[PDB]
Design a binder for this molecule. Structure first.
Ligand SMILES: CC(C)CCC[C@@H](C)[C@H]1CC[C@H]2[C@@H]3CC=C4C[C@@H](O)CC[C@]4(C)[C@H]3CC[C@]12C
Lengths: 34, 175, 27, 185, 137, 158, 86, 48
């Protein structure tokens, strides 16, 4: 309970990173597809 | 003489924190590997080297490779923040432990016993000690007597062997 | 833990040595 | 080869889903002592929803857990709903389904990718649920311990991460094969 | 350092021993212990195991040093070298003597306890005179 | 209880496996050398002669590259047992230390450029001496390993 | 990060801006703050000045955080919300 | 490197000491606190 905040922040950063990665992948694939 | 346990160096942090540290290490490494080796866009961040990088990050060592993408750098940054907080907390709580263990002044006189109350002290029910405390004109023993006859329920005792046994059974809670 | 890790590293190095020797003798 | 890796991925998906469903339904997460046991209290084995007394007059009777400061309220809500372990199981199921589809639409390569993303996200959700559970249990009656359901959840997390790794590797190999074939053609 | 050298020489990554000889192994270990970085990190699982355990060891030891030093600097504790009389007889750095021509010396002289016999031997074979002529002295 | 000497014993126990590995490699290489020597040494085929010579040279180079680690690691053992003030084990280990020192720094071979020399190697006397030395060294290392394990356990439990 | 970016773009070592753009500048600064290392370190005196002062800042701040946390965990102090009637 | 390690550890440790001691300080708030201590002197009017 003392350090739950860093765990929440870390998991949020992981989810954000995965989302950014998928966004870049879709955008790049669409761009290279044209 | 309290024999320190092997793996007493883990005592500053609870078992749950270590468990979740391991879990977060695995998750961080997998997410790094993924966000580095998914897009057919090379990268040295496989699953073995992701684990290596995460481990070295946790120990504040650093390794040869470092992320170059936005997602990998987000992952590394949050892992770095987590590592910083956790290591600082470990060091600080260990310092707290040792400092407190260094403050501890045991009982060495009647006054030390008198002021504190975490330990109970009582003498024989009938004897010269009870009379000596009752009929005392001294400050410290007056305070003891004021405490004495309290709701231990029974600090007093009937037999000396009874007092010795009671002290032995009590885990330092009786004097 | 340090001694255990050193011993495990020696063991894993021996395993890798045998594995690589066999794969190379195949080549 | 690819076939064995896909087989391991599907087996791991099924196993992780089963373990997590077992852990959620099961009520052997925490062994502790509670005031409401009919005699600091009596031994109890609990879970996510209900608590059962053992070694007591009311032995065998299981009763729904009585949950209940904005952050504390949110934590209590999340712990009661147990939405994170349930989401982990759901995502594992969907990932296994996507893998099975990948066993059919061998052309579409962006399926065994969704499977891996879902497995990794399920592992993250399981981490979050574990953290929430542990945090909520604490308050401010000792010598407590964790049961085999908790470790089933942990095993589910580990398996999910492993099979996500395998699925991503499969996607890598498949995309590499297709791209090299196309470029060389 | 030695284990890293061996593991990297006879089970190399495959070259891998011109890196992580004994000299560079010692250097890597030292840089690890001092929380610095590394111009080389192992690539094989065995060398990486060695490095990981060394890293854990270093982290724990540095944290412990800092924490115990904070304890020392926060709490002053002056220990008396002596808490009894046997401690005083065993010690030779500290000198002790009574008042000359007094009852205390007469006590130590005619003693039968072992410790006080040893003290009397010392005081009779002591240079300069441990004894004294007055209390204030 | 745990102490400096016990840690020294643990570390020496871990490092003696390496010495066992080295001596086993020595005896295997010398068994191969014997298989080449006792077997007919006819060199009528230039290719066969070249192959045999290069095999001998390779094995000699391997043995030379592999000797210093053994001697220096045993010296490390001796130094550790000196610093820890474990006199008995240091006494048991000094004779092998001096034997290794003498062996490395004498070069009884008249060439006196390498401990093992391809030209001097293939000699039956030298081959047999090396084989016997390696076997005795293997026995000694096994015995010392078990002694170190026993001493470690003894020091820990007490 | 911004000052490092500027100093490395318009006063490069002479190339020197493909390294230490804004993104890599932020990364270097973050790695410095967290006591990690760096895949790049500045070669010019100005970038090195920036890095040195950032390094000093990081050292002081991390030490202060750890020390004050040790204080907090060593000494419990419960403050009453009220010390009067107003 | 050794010098740096010792110096940084000493800085952190002594800063922790400073802050911890500054956190122990309990001012005078009653007659007892004044009574036990003696680093401060207290006296009233000669006649009164
Ligand atoms: C301590 C160990 C490891 C090495 C040194 C031990 C000595 C005593 C060993 C090493 C090699 C040994 C020799 C090897 C070969 C032979 C065969 C024959 O000619 C009689 C004994 C003789 C000559 C051995 C005598 C003992 C010997 C000299």
């Amino acid at each position: 309970s003392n350090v739950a905040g860093v765990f929440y922040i870390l998991v949020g950063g992981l989810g954000l990173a995965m989302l950014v990665a998928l966004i870049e992948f879709c955008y790049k694939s669409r761009a290279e597809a044209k | 003489k309290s024999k320190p346990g092997v793996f007493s160096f883990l005592d500053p942090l609870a078992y749950e924190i270590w468990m979740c540290i391991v879990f977060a290490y695995i998750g961080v490494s997998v997410v790094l590997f993924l966000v580095s080796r998914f897009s057919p866009y090379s990268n040295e961040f496989g699953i073995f080297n992701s684990l290596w990088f995460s481990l070295g990050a946790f120990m504040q060592q650093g390794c040869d490779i470092s992320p170059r993408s936005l997602s990998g750098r987000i992952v590394g940054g949050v892992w770095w923040f987590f590592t910083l907080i956790i290591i600082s907390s470990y060091t600080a709580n260990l310092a707290a432990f040792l400092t407190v263990e260094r403050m501890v002044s045991p009982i060495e006189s009647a006054e030390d016993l008198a002021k504190q109350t975490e330990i109970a002290y009582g003498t024989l029910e009938a004897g010269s000690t009870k009379e000596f405390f009752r009929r005392s004109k001294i400050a410290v023993f007056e305070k003891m007597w004021t405490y004495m006859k309290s709701a231990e329920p029974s600090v007093f005792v009937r037999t000396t062997e009874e007092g010795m046994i009671r002290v032995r059974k009590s885990k330092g809670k009786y004097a | 833990i340090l001694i255990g890790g050193l011993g495990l590293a020696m063991l894993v190095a021996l395993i890798e040595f045998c594995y690589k020797s066999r794969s190379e003798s195949k080549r | 080869e690819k076939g064995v890796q896909v087989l391991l991925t599907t087996i791991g998906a099924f196993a992780a889903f089963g373990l997590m469903t077992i852990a959620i339904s099961t009520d052997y997460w925490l062994y502790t002592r509670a005031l409401i046991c009919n005699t600091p209290g009596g031994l109890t084995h609990s879970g996510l929803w209900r608590i059962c007394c053992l070694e007591g007059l009311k032995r065998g009777v299981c009763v729904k857990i009585n949950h209940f400061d904005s952050a504390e309220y949110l934590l209590r809500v999340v712990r009661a709903s147990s939405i994170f372990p349930i989401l982990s199981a759901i995502l594992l199921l969907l990932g296994g389904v996507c893998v099975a589809a990948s066993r059919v639409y061998k052309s579409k390569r962006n399926i065994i990718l969704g499977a891996g993303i879902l497995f990794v996200a399920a592992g993250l959700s399981n981490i979050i649920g574990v953290i929430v559970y542990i945090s909520a249990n604490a308050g401010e009656k000792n010598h407590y311990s964790y049961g085999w359901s908790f470790y089933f959840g942990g095993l589910s997390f580990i398996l999910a991460e492993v099979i996500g790794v395998l699925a991503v590797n499969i996607y890598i190999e498949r995309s590499r094969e297709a791209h090299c074939q196309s470029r060389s053609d | 350092s030695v284990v890293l050298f061996l593991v990297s020489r006879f089970s190399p990554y495959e070259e891998s021993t011109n890196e992580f000889g004994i000299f560079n192994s010692l250097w890597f270990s030292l840089g690890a212990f001092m929380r610095q970085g590394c111009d080389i990190s192992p690539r094989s699982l065995s060398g990486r195991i060695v490095g990981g355990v060394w890293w854990f060891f270093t982290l724990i030891i540095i944290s412990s040093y800092t924490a115990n030093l904070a304890a020392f600097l926060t709490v002053e504790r002056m220990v008396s070298p002596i808490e009894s009389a046997e401690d005083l007889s065993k010690q030779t750095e500290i000198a002790y003597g009574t008042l000359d021509s007094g009852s205390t010396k007469e006590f130590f002289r005619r003693s039968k306890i072992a410790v006080f016999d040893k003290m009397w031997t010392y005081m009779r074979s002591a240079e300069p005179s441990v004894f004294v002529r007055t209390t204030a002295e | 209880a745990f102490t400096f000497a016990a840690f020294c014993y643990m570390l020496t126990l871990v490092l003696c496996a390496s010495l066992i590995f080295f001596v086993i490699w020595h005896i295997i290489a010398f068994d191969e050398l014997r298989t080449d020597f006792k077997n007919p040494i006819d060199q009528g085929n230039p290719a066969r002669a070249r192959e045999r010579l290069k095999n001998i040279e390779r094995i000699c180079c391997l043995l030379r590259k592999l000797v210093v680690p053994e001697y220096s690691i045993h010296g490390l053992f001796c130094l550790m047992f000196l610093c820890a003030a474990e006199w008995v084990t240091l006494g048991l280990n000094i004779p092998l230390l001096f034997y290794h020192l003498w062996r490395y720094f004498h070069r009884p071979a008249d060439g006196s450029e390498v401990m093992y020399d391809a030209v001097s190697i293939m000699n039956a006397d030298i081959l047999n001496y090396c084989q016997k030395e390696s076997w005795c060294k293997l026995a000694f290392y096994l015995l010392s390993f078990f002694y170190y394990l026993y001493s470690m356990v003894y020091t820990l439990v007490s």
